[PDB]
């Protein structure tokens, strides 16, 4: 497919297939580029273009290894601001990719895993590159993500309420209470533990919740 | 309703009459933690108040419950033992 | 992909995690205070100038 | 001598500095003649160096290097049975791959290890040949040739030390086959060492359950018979001189459940000892304590084997643990669906004791989900108190939904298309959806079936269904029969147990008909309705809006909900008409769901499928004929055409048909053939007995990555549908169905290829017993 060419002759055609939007061959060029020249001078920049070609072709299992490969090539880079975003971005596409949105159905209760794995990377990013342009974006991803977990965990804390499992209600909320200071899912789990307490005759603790209910409706 | 079939529901996290004898007011949470372990609830914004609370639905024959709240002080030295059944 | 009545031309790509707003903090009263974050939510709350979503670069 | 410049010739994978620092004399260093020789082997110590020849011009080093870097390809030839990646795993075991340093010293060494792989795999008579084929600018192809003579096969095992049982009956327990006849093939005979290891334990069990408590395998030596085929074994054991279970001496943390333990150690003193029973009996306590809250019920027994009397005494040491191990539960792999669907499919509550029975039932609740691939969890005892276990249900889902398609009438014609779609577990909500219907020039059918399985939290499985069949039997729009049929029926989930559940529902059905055919049993129904029209004209209309109470009940014991292995699911369904209906009748039916694993590998599973159905009037009336039972053509019997097994219709002479298209649709029509004739169309019976005999079989030609998705099963599918109210007086030149003995048959093999949208089932069958004839399509292609 991609034969023995000069590396730039591979790379410009890879840049062509990137600018053609043909990530399929742009993956196929850049691999045999770094197969023929892993000692390529831009073999690191092959990977950044590869994850570019992976993600635009939606190729996270290739983008999983390459982000680890870029670390395993050299874990120190100026390009981690791409990569640590792109790993969270990989986890963002790994979080949810289904089509249920136009059905009036949301995906914020499905995967906490690559949610938190993105929340791992995006927090590492705003740790590792608070200077890079991604930090405006990645923080807003993190802003979105905690409530996405909260709504997910609210949907968990919903079920034990609809189950009536009030002991299983509380600690699910007690997680969110020691997780989220701002999320409205926590603000709306806030009345229910009071109820769960009053179903558990912990009315006294529930009026102590009802203060916070008053205080966080304030 | 008029349906004798209702499925049973249980909760867990309670203690025995031997277990409530295993501690006294004045004892540590650790002394509860040695004899009874911890329960699966305490008072998070307030003092050490350990909750061995049971809930149970039999199946359209009543509802069953046993609440055991164990208020220590902040030091974890026990200050209150309150057993509470259903209703 | 391609089409002739064209409601297929909406293909992948979004900034969904960018679109919302942040949320409203805790104002719990005295004595009813419990710790609010134990998770990984202790992030460095900062930005790095703009360039968000599709405006974010791809190197 | 201090080198001014080192000349780095032919490195090609390593850097100059990766060459330079590995030289024990670097540039600018004092050069020694030992350091010349040190530059030889340390550069050779890369393994990428084919030559190192270190010279200088006075002091300025010139290191003449040829290079053995990257293998650029690895080619296999002759491995045809075995996967050559398993062979490549031995290269990965030797640190060798494509893009890895060539080392021609390691050719025969790994070649040995592939033949040592062959030595271990059950061959020894198998050679390999790595052929180094040099590729551009440093590179090499690992062409690999494999010269496989023969594997080793089981021949005969000597057993010594057995002195009560047969050698031969011991082999009958085993994996160890050394016979496949010229007129029998049940499998193969080949060797593997790990078969023997369990067959030690198969033997080790086999004496232990008798009583043999001084039983011990002395040694076991496989003959290295000099033929490269002969697998002969001496296995040396000590017999054991069987001992009695004379008593149980349980001890330790009995946790107050000690009487239950005594029920769990209800034993016989003097019983000829069975440690496998004890192997069971200890875990019954661990299952007892697994429901009594204790997740680490440490039970360490001790058989005080008393050789003075040939008895054992059974010390048991119990350590229960914590009473409330269940903290909470984690649920993962929900990345498509809703977890509250899965979390309502559990029976363990958080903040509880360990109930082990609550776990696996909830796992069985996910087993009877049928929209999954792995049911699996991690009972993580959280570090801290042993009140903390968080049980982590990382599970794998499966494809939902199915379309089915059976279109005809050409692509170039008018309004005609067949449809049908399912989205059971709609969008992770669990909503059981299946929707069909058609717009045809023969009908306009509408159909819906949606279910909230949990409209109440118990599992009120609120399922709504409706239909609208505006059928016309297209001669003009009429003239065979007009029939608009429509109505609805909603039925909910009624838990009789957690494996038993009832159904009960009410069916609205309006049918509106005109120009019906003069023919006997259709009109025999009408005469049972007291309606006796003109028997030579289709000048007849009929309007019915029947109201019926429907019901059902499900026994639910089969393992998976999509791919089970064992059990039985008895799913009763039936109906009765109510007052206000336009006809007073009923129908009752039942089809079974029984799996019979041939071996308890559950690889071959017999699928016992028979079907029952009976429909009748409620006294003085009749069940109508459209719900008479129909069969054949992948119904319960394959290889026929659809709904072709049953009683067959007898037509009156039509002298009016309201239209005839000049001798077309001939059913004794108004033009031609107008006589009392019998159609080969199956009119169907008021009673049904059809069955299908299915037997799961694996196939070696499929990878079991996806052979476990594909179910292959032969059959001999027979059945009878018959009319218990059939007569000989109305049917005298016409055959009879008053007898139940109306049995057709068609036989073949079934297959499902589980596509990315699930099984798309194809079926061939061929009739070898046919009761009075039907219509046949021997190959059938379904979904």
């Amino acid at each position: 497919e991609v034969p023995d060419n000069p590396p730039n002759e591979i790379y410009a055609t890879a840049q062509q297939k990137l600018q053609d939007g043909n990530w399929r061959q742009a993956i196929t060029q850049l691999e045999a580029l770094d197969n023929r020249y892993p000692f390529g001078p831009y073999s690191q920049q092959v990977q950044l273009d590869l994850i570019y070609a992976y993600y635009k072709n939606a190729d996270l299992p290739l983008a999983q290894a390459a982000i680890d490969r870029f670390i395993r090539l050299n874990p120190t880079h100026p390009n981690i601001d791409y990569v640590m975003y792109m790993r969270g971005l990989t986890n963002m596409a790994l979080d949810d990719s289904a089509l249920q949105g136009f059905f009036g159905v949301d995906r914020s209760d499905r995967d906490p895993q690559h949610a938190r794995a993105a929340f791992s990377d995006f927090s590492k990013l705003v740790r590792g590159y608070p200077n890079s342009q991604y930090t405006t974006d990645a923080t807003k991803r993190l802003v979105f993500l905690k409530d996405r977990l909260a709504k997910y965990e609210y949907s968990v804390a919903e079920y034990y309420t609809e189950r009536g499992a009030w002991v299983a209600v509380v600690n699910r909320v007690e997680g969110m209470l020691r997780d989220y200071p701002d999320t409205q899912a926590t603000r709306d789990a806030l009345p229910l533990m009071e109820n769960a307490y009053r179903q558990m005759q912990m009315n006294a603790q529930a009026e102590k919740v009802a203060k916070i209910i008053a205080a966080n409706s304030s | 309703e008029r349906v004798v079939y209702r499925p049973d529901i249980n909760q867990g996290n309670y203690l025995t009459a031997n277990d409530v004898s295993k501690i006294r007011v004045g004892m540590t949470q650790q002394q509860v933690a040695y004899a009874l372990g911890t329960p699966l609830m305490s008072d998070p914004f307030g003092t050490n108040t350990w909750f061995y609370v049971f809930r149970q639905q039999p199946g359209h024959e009543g509802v069953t419950q046993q609440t055991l709240t164990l208020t220590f002080n902040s030091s974890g030295v026990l200050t209150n033992i309150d057993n509470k059944p259903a209703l | 992909c391609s089409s002739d009545s064209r409601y297929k031309r909406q293909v992948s790509g979004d900034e969904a995690y960018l679109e919302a707003a942040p949320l409203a903090e805790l104002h719990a009263p005295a004595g009813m205070i419990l710790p609010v974050t134990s998770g990984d939510y202790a992030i460095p709350v900062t930005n790095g100038s703009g360039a968000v979503g599709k405006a974010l670069d791809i190197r | 001598f201090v080198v001014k410049d080192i000349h780095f010739e032919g490195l090609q994978r390593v850097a100059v500095g990766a060459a330079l620092l590995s030289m024990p004399v670097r540039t600018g260093d004092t050069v020694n003649d030992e350091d010349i020789s040190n530059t030889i082997r340390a550069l050779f110590a890369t393994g990428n160096f084919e030559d190192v020849r270190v010279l200088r011009d006075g002091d300025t080093l010139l290191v003449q290097v040829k290079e053995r870097p990257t293998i650029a390809s690895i080619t296999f030839s002759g491995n045809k049975s075995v996967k050559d990646d398993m062979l490549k795993q031995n290269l990965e075991a030797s640190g060798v791959r494509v893009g890895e340093s060539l080392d021609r010293t390691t050719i025969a060494d790994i070649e040995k290890g592939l033949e040592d792989f062959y030595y271990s795999v059950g061959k020894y008579s198998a050679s390999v040949k790595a052929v180094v084929t040099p590729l551009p600018r440093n590179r090499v192809d690992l062409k690999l040739v494999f010269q496989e003579g023969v594997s080793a096969e089981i021949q005969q095992i000597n057993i010594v030390g057995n002195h009560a049982f047969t050698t031969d009956e011991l082999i009958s327990h085993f994996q160890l086959r050394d016979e496949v006849p010229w007129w029998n093939v049940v499998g193969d005979r080949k060797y593997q060492k790990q078969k023997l290891a369990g067959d030690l334990e198969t033997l080790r069990s086999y004496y232990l359950d008798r009583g043999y408590a001084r039983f011990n395998i002395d040694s076991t030596q496989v003959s290295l018979t000099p033929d490269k085929k002969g697998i002969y074994v001496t296995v040396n054991i000590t017999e054991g001189d069987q001992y009695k279970l004379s008593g149980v001496e349980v001890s330790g943390n009995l946790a107050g459940h000690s009487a239950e333990i005594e029920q769990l150690t209800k034993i016989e003193p003097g019983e000829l000892y069975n440690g496998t029973k004890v192997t069971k009996m200890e875990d019954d306590i661990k299952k007892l304590l697994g429901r009594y809250g204790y997740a680490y019920p440490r039970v360490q027994s001790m058989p005080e084997i008393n050789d003075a009397d040939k008895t054992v005494k059974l010390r048991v040491n119990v350590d229960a643990g914590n009473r409330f191990y269940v903290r909470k539960i984690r649920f993962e792999g929900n990345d498509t669906s809703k977890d509250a669907v899965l979390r309502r499919e559990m029976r363990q509550m958080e903040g509880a004791w360990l109930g082990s029975d609550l776990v696996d039932q909830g796992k069985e609740r996910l087993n009877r989900l049928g929209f999954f691939e792995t049911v699996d969890t991690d009972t993580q005892r959280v570090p801290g108190s042993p009140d903390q276990v968080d049980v982590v249900y990382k599970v794998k889902e499966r494809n939902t939904g199915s379309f089915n398609f059976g279109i005809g009438y050409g692509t170039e014609s008018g309004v005609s298309f067949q449809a049908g779609v399912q989205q059971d577990n709609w969008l992770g909500t669990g909503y059981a959806v299946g929707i069909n219907g058609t717009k045809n020039d023969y009908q306009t059918y509408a159909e819906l079936s949606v279910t909230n399985p949990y409209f109440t939290v118990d599992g009120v499985s609120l399922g709504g269904r409706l239909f609208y069949n505006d059928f016309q039997a297209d001669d003009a729009d009429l003239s065979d029969y007009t029939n608009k049929s429509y109505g609805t029926d909603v039925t909910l989930g009624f838990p009789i147990n957690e494996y038993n559940s009832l159904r009960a529902g009410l069916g609205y059905v309006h049918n509106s008909l005109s120009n019906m055919q003069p023919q006997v049993a259709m009109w025999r129904y009408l005469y049972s309705m007291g309606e006796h029209p003109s028997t030579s004209d289709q000048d007849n209309s009929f309007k019915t809006d029947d109201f019926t109470f429907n019901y059902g009940w499900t026994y639910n014991k089969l393992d998976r909900g999509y791919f089970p292995t064992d059990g039985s699911r008895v799913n009763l369904t039936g109906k009765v008409t109510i007052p206000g209906s336009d006809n007073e009748y009923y129908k009752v039916t039942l089809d079974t769901a029984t799996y019979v694993p041939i071996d308890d590998d559950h690889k071959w599973v017999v699928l016992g499928r028979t079907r029952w159905g009976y429909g009748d009037g409620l006294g003085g009336k009749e069940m109508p004929f459209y719900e008479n039972f129909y069969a054949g053509g992948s119904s319960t019997v394959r290889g026929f055409q659809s709904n072709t097994i049953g009683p067959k219709a007898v037509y009156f002479p039509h002298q009016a048909s309201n239209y005839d298209p000049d001798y077309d649709y001939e059913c004794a029509t108004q033009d031609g053939a107008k006589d009392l004739c019998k159609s080969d169309d199956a009119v169907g019976g008021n009673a049904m007995a059809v069955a299908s005999l299915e037997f799961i079989t694996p196939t070696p030609f499929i990878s079991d990555k996806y052979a476990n998705s594909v179910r292959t099963s032969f059959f001999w599918d027979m059945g009878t549908v018959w009319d218990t109210n059939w007569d000989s007086s109305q049917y005298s030149g016409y055959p009879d169905y008053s007898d139940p003995s109306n049995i057709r048959m068609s036989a073949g093999i079934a297959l499902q290829w589980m596509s990315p949208l699930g099984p798309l089932v194809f079926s061939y069958a061929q009739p070898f017993k046919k009761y009075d004839g039907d219509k046949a399509e021997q190959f059938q292609f379904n979904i």
Binding site: - | - | - | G78, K80, S81, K112, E115, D116, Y119, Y124, S125, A126, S127, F146, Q147, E148, G149, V150, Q155, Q156, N158, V160, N162, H163, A164, F165, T166, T167, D168, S219, Q221, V222, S223, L224, T225, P226, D227, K228, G230, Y232, V233, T234, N236
Partner: protein, 371 residues
């Protein structure tokens, strides 16, 4: 599929069927279907011109070797036990001395039938069947059993004199280390390649010497007809180890005079200084005793299924498990005769003695051969 699924490496055929000295049989008197393609170490006896031959099926014969007419016949195919209706199932070859037909059975129950009638003059259940010939000399039945033990058993009644493990490989690495009574020492080879001299009279190790490094990290053969039974010329053992590594080594210390580790030799006879041997490719060679300096070879026999080479009619005679016999020009290699007396072939060996050549073919057992 299965016409294309096959894979078998090649074994060279038999060329050169010669009949320069017209070979015959003396007679056939065959016991029956003998060992067959079943593997055991059975081999008949011909003492006092009596063919003590049997089959591993169970029929035992004594054949008066003139047409091999029967002297006596018994059947140690037994009838009941923890297995009922026993066959013979013999592990050790037919040894006869005294009124005792010493045979090792795969039952690990060994016998000594009164040679006048074949009634069991004594018998013994022993620790494992014999992996070698019942070596019977000096009051002692010298056994290399399955367990690698030097099982010494009294030949007069079946009293175990001792039982001492020499060489225990990873599995039954099948070596025929028949413990040779040689010059007062228990001289025995190895199923590993570790060779040894032990005391004959008590089982006291004179020495034990490693020669062949066994398969598993030093991989060796499982087709070769390796005589791991030793041969001593009084001070020097001239023997093969477990793969066929030929070694001249001292009787009393085990110290190597010379060794052909290059040999993976199948069979051998030390004929003076002309060790007439069967090479590993089922071809012929012959080396010295003064070094392993090769005298000659032959590869007309090549990849055949051979028995031992014997000296009959002044000729190097050899048979094979394809049922041929063959007559090597004893020094100069050449086929002089070829008697394909059967096709059943031989797992026992030719016995170029009593003026005859005793074999037990696999199915047509006893042919007595002449030319």
């Amino acid at each position: 599929l299965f016409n294309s699924e096959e894979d078998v490496v090649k074994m060279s055929p038999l060329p050169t069927v010669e009949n320069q000295f017209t070979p015959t049989t003396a007679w056939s008197t065959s016991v029956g279907s003998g060992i067959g393609n079943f593997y055991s170490n059975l081999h008949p006896a011909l003492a006092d011109n009596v063919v003590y031959a049997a089959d591993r099926a169970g029929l035992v014969k004594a054949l008066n070797a003139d047409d091999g007419k029967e002297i006596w016949s018994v059947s140690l195919a037994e009838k009941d036990g923890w297995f009922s209706k026993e066959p013979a199932l013999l592990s050790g070859g037919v040894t006869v001395s005294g009124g005792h037909v010493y045979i090792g059975s795969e039952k690990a129950q060994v016998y000594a039938l009164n040679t006048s009638d074949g009634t069991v003059a004594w018998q013994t259940k022993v620790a494992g069947e014999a992996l070698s010939r019942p070596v019977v000399s000096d009051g002692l039945v010298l056994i290399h059993t399955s367990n690698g033990q030097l099982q010494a058993l009294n030949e007069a009644d079946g009293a175990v004199k001792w039982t001492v493990n020499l060489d225990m490989p990873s599995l039954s690495l099948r070596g025929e280390s028949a413990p040779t009574t040689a010059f007062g020492a228990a001289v025995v080879g190895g199923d590993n390649g570790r060779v040894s001299a032990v005391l004959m009279e008590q089982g006291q190790m004179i020495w034990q010497q490693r020669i062949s490094q066994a398969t598993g990290s030093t991989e060796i053969d499982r087709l070769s007809d390796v005589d791991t039974t030793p041969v001593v010329v009084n001070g020097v053992v001239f023997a093969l180890a477990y793969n066929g590594n030929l070694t001249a080594l001292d009787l009393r210390s085990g110290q190597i005079m010379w060794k052909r580790e290059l040999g993976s030799v199948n069979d051998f006879i030390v004929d003076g200084n002309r060790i007439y041997l069967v090479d590993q490719n089922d071809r012929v060679m012959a080396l010295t005793i003064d070094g392993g300096v090769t005298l000659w070879t032959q590869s007309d026999l090549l990849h055949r299924l051979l028995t031992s080479p014997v000296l009959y009619n002044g000729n190097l005679v050899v048979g094979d498990s394809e049922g041929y016999l063959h007559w090597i020009n004893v020094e100069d290699g050449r086929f002089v005769a070829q008697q394909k007396v059967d096709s059943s072939g031989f797992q026992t060996e030719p016995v170029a003695a009593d003026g005859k050549l005793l074999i037990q073919a696999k199915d047509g057992t006893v042919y007595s051969i002449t030319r």
